[PDB]
Design a protein around this nucleic acid. Sequence first.
RNA 1: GGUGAGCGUAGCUCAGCUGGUUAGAGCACCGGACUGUGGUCCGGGGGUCGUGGGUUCAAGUCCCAUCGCUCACCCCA
RNA 2: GGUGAGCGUAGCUCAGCUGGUUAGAGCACCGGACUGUGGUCCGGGGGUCGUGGGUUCAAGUCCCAUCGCUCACCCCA
Lengths: 409, 409
Amino acid sequence: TARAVRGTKDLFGKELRMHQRIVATARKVLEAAGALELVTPIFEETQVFEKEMFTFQDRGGRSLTLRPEGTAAMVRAYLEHGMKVWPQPVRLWMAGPMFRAERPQKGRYRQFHQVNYEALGSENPILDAEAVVLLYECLKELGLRRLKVKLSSVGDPEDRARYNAYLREVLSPHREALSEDSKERLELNPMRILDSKSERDQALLKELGVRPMLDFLGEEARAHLKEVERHLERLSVPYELEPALVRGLDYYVRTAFEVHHEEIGAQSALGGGGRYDGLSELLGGPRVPGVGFAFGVERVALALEAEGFGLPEEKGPDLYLIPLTEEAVAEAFYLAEALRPRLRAEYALAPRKPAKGLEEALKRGAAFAGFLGEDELRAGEVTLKRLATGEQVRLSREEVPGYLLQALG
Amino acid sequence: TARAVRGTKDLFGKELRMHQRIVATARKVLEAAGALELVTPIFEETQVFEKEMFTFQDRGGRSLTLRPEGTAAMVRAYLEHGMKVWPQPVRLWMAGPMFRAERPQKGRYRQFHQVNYEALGSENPILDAEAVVLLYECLKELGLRRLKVKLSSVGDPEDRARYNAYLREVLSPHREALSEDSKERLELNPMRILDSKSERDQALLKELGVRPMLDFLGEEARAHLKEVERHLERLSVPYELEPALVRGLDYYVRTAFEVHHEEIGAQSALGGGGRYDGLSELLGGPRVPGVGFAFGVERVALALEAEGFGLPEEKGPDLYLIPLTEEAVAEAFYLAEALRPRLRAEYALAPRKPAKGLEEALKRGAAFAGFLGEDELRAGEVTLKRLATGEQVRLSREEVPGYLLQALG
RNA sequence: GGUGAGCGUAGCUCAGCUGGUUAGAGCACCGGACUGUGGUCCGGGGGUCGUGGGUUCAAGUCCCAUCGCUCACCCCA
RNA sequence: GGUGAGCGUAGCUCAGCUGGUUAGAGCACCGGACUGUGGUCCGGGGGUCGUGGGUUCAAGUCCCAUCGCUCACCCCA
Ligand SMILES: Nc1ncnc2c1ncn2[C@@H]1O[C@H](COP(=O)(O)O)[C@@H](O)[C@H]1O
Ligand SMILES: Nc1ncnc2c1ncn2[C@@H]1O[C@H](COP(=O)(O)O)[C@@H](O)[C@H]1O
Ligand SMILES: N[C@@H](Cc1c[nH]c[nH+]1)C(=O)O
Ligand SMILES: N[C@@H](Cc1c[nH]c[nH+]1)C(=O)O
C-alpha cells in the first residue's frame, strides 16, 4: 500500500539502460574536452542555493536543502578544494539527481537527473563557444538530429536594468490590456511578459513595437557576444539568434543559451546554460567567472525515443540450468557457482519438466540449456543444448567449463 | 566561506575512480547471477523506513525520509511494480547514496554509498548460501584477500523471545556488576550486552557461563541454518560460526551474516545481510520472504588501499595544443574541435612560451604536443611532437587528423 | 504548492447502454493433457470495479466528496 | 544528536622555547633569466596564525569560550 511519492519513479530495464548510455556518452564527450568529473553531496547548507525546493533541518538546527541545481554546488566545490591554484580554466562535469518542488507533467519531475558542465576561472568567449559546442555534441553523439540551438545575451546588470525600466515605461499605460499573469509580472518581473503564452499579450507586444533585449546590450556584453557568434560561425554551428533568453537569477550575465527538441511535450528544453559572474561571491569567495550548461537525462531519453532510437536487445545468460529432480537443484546451484562470474549462469530453483524449463530458457534468451536429471546426477554429468543450432552433448561435469569457454568464443 | 556539511564529501580523481571500479565489479558479479538493476528515489514516504535519520515535510504536509537503507525500498519496488507475477525468486541489485544521522568517524559518514542485493519470493536456504557467496565474490573479485566471513542465525521470533527472557533471567540479579551502558541495554535490548566492549561485562559473561543464541534455535530455524552451512561447506566457503549476530529490527529472521576486514578502523564491517520475513506486510503487502546484503563502497575502498591495490595512472590527452601568439589560441580551439571526441585534444587558453607549454604538456601526460605560432598560422599548418620519442613533424592542418589516427593505433 | 481539464475495472493492455438480478478478454505467473527436450490443448489463484457517502427494489454504470495517475498553465534555477 | 580525547600557521604537507619587538619552508599557480621546444636559476600574489574575548610593555605561543576537522564510545538498519 506504500508507493513512490508523486514526482519520483523507480528505474530499471530499458529506461535505466537508456539513462546509463546517455551519461556514458556525456562522460566521453566532455572528458575529450578535458573536463574533470565531480560528485557533490545530495544536500547542501541552504545558503548555497538561495540567491519551491526541498528544505529541512537536522537536529543541530542547521537548514539543509536537497540539491535543486548543479552549478552553485560545483562552484562551492571550486572554492572548497582550492581550485584557484590549478591551471585555469578548470573544467568540471557532474551527473546526478536534482530535486525540485513544482507540479509534474511531461518531462518534468520532482526528482530528475542532470548532466552539468562548468568552465571556471576565465572570461574568454572561446569558453562560451566551447560550452555551446559541447552541449550540441553530447546530444549529437547520442544520435539526435532535429535540434534547435537558441543563443542570446542577458547583458551585464546595467543593461538588464535598462531593459526592465524600458519595458515598464512602455507597458504601464496599457496594463489594462494585459492578462492577469502579465500584470503580476509587470509588477516585478517584466521580461517574463515577453515569453507570455497569452495571444493578446503577444498581439500587444507586436503593435507597441517593443524592442528586443538585443538592442539594450552595452559595448562590452555586445562585443563579447560578437566574439562568441564569430566562433560558432567558424565551426559552422547553426543557432537561432534570440531577441531575449530570460534568466531568473541576476548573477547570470552575458551569454545565455538553450537547446530544444520537438515532441516530448510543452517543456521542450533539453538543456540550457550560459555565463555567470557573482555566484562565488555570494558563496563567500572571490571573483570566479563561469560558463556552463545542464541538461535533463529524462528529456533526452524522450527525444531519443521520439526519433526512433532504441536499445539493442538485452543479452541473456550464457547457460540456464534445468533440474529435473529434487536433489538436482542444489547440484545445478553448485555447477552454476563453478562457472561464475566468467560466464553468466542461472538455474531454476525447483524441479521443472524438461519442456517447461526449455521454454523458460528460450524466454530468457539463453545460449545453452543444461539438463540435470537422475541420469546426469548418477554419472556425475550434465546435458548441454546449444539453443541456436539444437545440438546436444552429454558431458562430465569436470569437463564442462572448458567446453562452454571454447563454445562461446 | 560555504563548506560541504559535516559527514559529506565531494568525490573526484582517484577516489571517484575507485568507487566506480567497485560498483562496476559488483554489477558484473551480481548480474552474472541473474540479478536485475534497480534505482529507487532518494527519499521515500517516512512510513516505509520506520519499522537517527533525515526526515522532513514537503508543503503538502507529508513526512518524507532521506533513504537510510536499501532493502525496504527494494521491497517497496517489488510491491509497486507487481513483481509477484515474475518468475520467482526475483533478484534485484542497486548501487547508490544512503543517509544516516550518526556522528562520523573512520568509515562512517552521513552520506555514504551502498551496494545492495535482494532475492525475493522464496524461503529456500540455497538463496542464503548464494547471497553469502555473492558478497564474498564481489569483495574477492575486487582483489581482496584477508576477509572474515561471519555467519549465524537470529532464529525465528519465538527463539529470540526465549533468548531475551533467558538473558534477562540470568543477568538481572547481577545488574550492579554491569556497566551503565549494559544496564540500559538490560532494560530493553539485552542481546547488545553480549557485544559489549566493556572488559568487566565480558568477564561477567564468561563467569556466568552464558549460553549462546545458537543454543536457542528451534527445529525449523536450526535445520534451515544446517542447510545453509551444508551448501557453504560444499562450495568450500570458509566462515566463522558466531554465537550470535545481533540484528536490531525484529523482521529479520534466521540467517544473519557479515564480512569484516582488518585495519580500516573500529567499524570493520565491510558489508552484511541476512534473511527477513514480515517486511512486506508492514509495507502493506502479502508475505514475501527475502534474503539479501548491503556493503559500503567507502569501506571497501579503505580495505583496497589497506591491501596495496592502487589504480593504473590516469590517461592523459592524445594531443595538447600550445598557441605561441594571440591569434593562434582560437585556431588551436578550432583544431581541437576538429579532432574531438574521436581523440582527446586540449589547448592552452593563452599564449605560452614553447618550453613552458611543452612542460604543461608533459605534466598532463600528453602523447603529442602541438605548436601553433605565426609560422604555422601563415602556412595553415601545425607542428607535432611525439613526446615519447621526441620526434617532430610539420603538417598541413587538413592532413593532421589522418596523421594522429594512424599514429595512435 | 496554486488553477484547470481528462482518466481510475486483476500485476500490465482493455471491453461493459444513468442501471438489471451470479464481473468479463489478452498478456503474465502456476498446475495437469503427453513415458526426459523448442517458444499445441484444459483448469487454476487472483479485483474491497481507487475510497467514502448519497440515490434506488437494484450501482462498475447516476449524484457528491475524497485520494491517486496524466497533461496544460502559474513558475522555471 | 549525547559523552570523550587530540588537532586548527598560505589552496596542500609542516617548522616556530607560556611570550620578545618587521611570520617562516616545500609543493602549487604566475611572471622574468635565455633569440620558437623536455619535466636549471630569480622574484612575485597570497595568511584576518580557525573565531571572539581575557592576561601582558609585548601573544602563533599563555588562560577562557566558541566554531570546525579527526578518532573512539553510545547507537548501528
Ligand atoms: N523538474 C525537472 N524535471 C525534469 N527535467 C528537468 C527539470 N528541471 C530541469 N530539467 C532539465 O534540466 C535542464 C536544465 O534545467 P534548468 O536548471 O532549469 O536550466 C532542462 O532543460 C531540462 O532538460
Ligand atoms: N554511516 C555509514 N557510513 C559509511 N558506510 C556505512 C554506514 N553505514 C553502513 N555502512 C556500510 O554499509 C554496510 C551495511 O550497513 P547496515 O545497513 O548497517 O547493514 C556496512 O557494513 C558498511 O560497510
Ligand atoms: N539552468 C542553468 C544551468 C546552468 C549550468 N551552468 C550554468 N547554468 C542555466 O540555464 O544557465
Ligand atoms: N543492514 C542490513 C542490510 C540488508 C540487506 N538485505 C537485507 N538486509 C543487514 O545486515 O541485514
